[PDB]
Design a protein around this ligand. Sequence first.
Ligand SMILES: O=C(c1ccc(OCCN2CCCCC2)cc1)c1c(-c2ccc(O)cc2)sc2cc(O)ccc12
Ligand SMILES: O=C(c1ccc(OCCN2CCCCC2)cc1)c1c(-c2ccc(O)cc2)sc2cc(O)ccc12
Lengths: 237, 226
Amino acid sequence: LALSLTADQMVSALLDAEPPILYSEYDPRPFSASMMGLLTNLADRELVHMINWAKRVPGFVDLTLHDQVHLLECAWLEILMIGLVWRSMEHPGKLLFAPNLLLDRNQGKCVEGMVEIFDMLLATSSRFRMMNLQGEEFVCLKSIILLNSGVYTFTLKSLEEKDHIHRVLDKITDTLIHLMAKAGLTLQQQHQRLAQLLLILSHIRHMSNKGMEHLYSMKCKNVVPSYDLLLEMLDAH
Amino acid sequence: LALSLTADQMVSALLDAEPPILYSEYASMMGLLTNLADRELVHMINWAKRVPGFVDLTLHDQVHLLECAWLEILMIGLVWRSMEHPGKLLFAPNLLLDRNQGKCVEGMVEIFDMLLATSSRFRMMNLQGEEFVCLKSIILLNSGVYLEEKDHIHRVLDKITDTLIHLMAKAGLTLQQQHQRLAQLLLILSHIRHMSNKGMEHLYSMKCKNVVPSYDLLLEMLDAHR
Ligand SMILES: O=C(c1ccc(OCCN2CCCCC2)cc1)c1c(-c2ccc(O)cc2)sc2cc(O)ccc12
Ligand SMILES: O=C(c1ccc(OCCN2CCCCC2)cc1)c1c(-c2ccc(O)cc2)sc2cc(O)ccc12
């Protein structure tokens, strides 16, 4: 039961749940149309692993299927983006979409309207580096995004669901504090770092919104995962 | 100067810096809201200049922070004055609107509902004025912060965190409760960013004369020394 986990058990559950790092193809490239096709193909494959990951975040499968879908509809691009930033952290000036799709700013220019968001993503990677963000902190933040982003936009059942999400979010706060304490930070340093980490989430939200507007401007048939697509992925037998 | 303030001195400074509540002057609905927002802007700049550490930034950087934060700041203010009015948004004391009135503006109701939900969250948490004033200052300093200038902003942000924790400690919260409440408050800021992004998209969709305050307007309001 999610609310019974110790901080150590929460960390271990989240690290265990992590999705794999996917590749692009692989063909002894480059890309004109082509770059967006590769990125779309990658994102579409990552979404499947994201659903698997979400179902392993403690407390998530306790929610109704409807609410699970809503949280993912709200969070999916933020989650792709924070994953991208983490993968890119050790690669100054580059975004590691995949190990074989490692792009710089000038390659971002090849997609109309992409550079400004590319720059925001690079700045977030820089911030992660400057904070020396740890993998255990990263998995906490990604779980927070999943549970928090859609909770403000959802009856008696809904009240029960929100209470549960808030309790699990509190457990994740406890877990972040535990990690910082185990690492030797003073109480003051712990609360300052907790705040610094959580403020990053506002920037991640900003980038997701700006990215979604950009995706929509491309006039493709499909931009967002539909309710029933998420449903089927989540609505397992 | 600013980084030597105690937590108590920080709180007093922020409370003292609070802008006034303006009245609406009286398609019409949006005309009224646009006029109100335009008038609130100067008062926001006056407030910003009183947030400890803000005026130590270059004017260029002060303007950038305002360009990034202005709508989030209007929104958090709206949410705060609407706390004690469940189901309604108190844009002005003479402009209290419910969601049915938000429906009269094409594309507004979705954001209206988000704002109401935020006000509802504030109510449930029993958000205090001293905490509100800290959160608003964090929006100002954090929203545009994407070397010496960034370091200064981060030191000020750390002082506001310390201040928030101090307020909680004095109120008798356990260490666990302090950390949990700090997190709860900061996560609401992600929702305020979201509402500002959606609101900006909405305002742009209206195809009015103008949406964002210009660099020159903000700089003029900041009233440079001479
Ligand atoms: O390029 C993409 C991207 C491309 C297509 C996407 O969606 C394709 C539509 N697809 C439909 C079915 C459901 C899943 C989405 C999503 C992201 C990525 C990003 C992006 C960056 C800047 C910007 O302006 C817009 C997006 S960030 C990102 C991280 C990834 O791991 C993968 C792709 C990406
Ligand atoms: O309606 C407005 C609003 C109207 C016009 C605005 O900008 C007018 C352009 N003006 C140009 C010169 C610089 C200042 C802005 C900003 C907010 C307000 C809001 C809003 C809500 C929902 C939504 O979908 C969009 C906006 S929130 C708000 C809070 C206020 O204190 C005042 C107006 C408002």
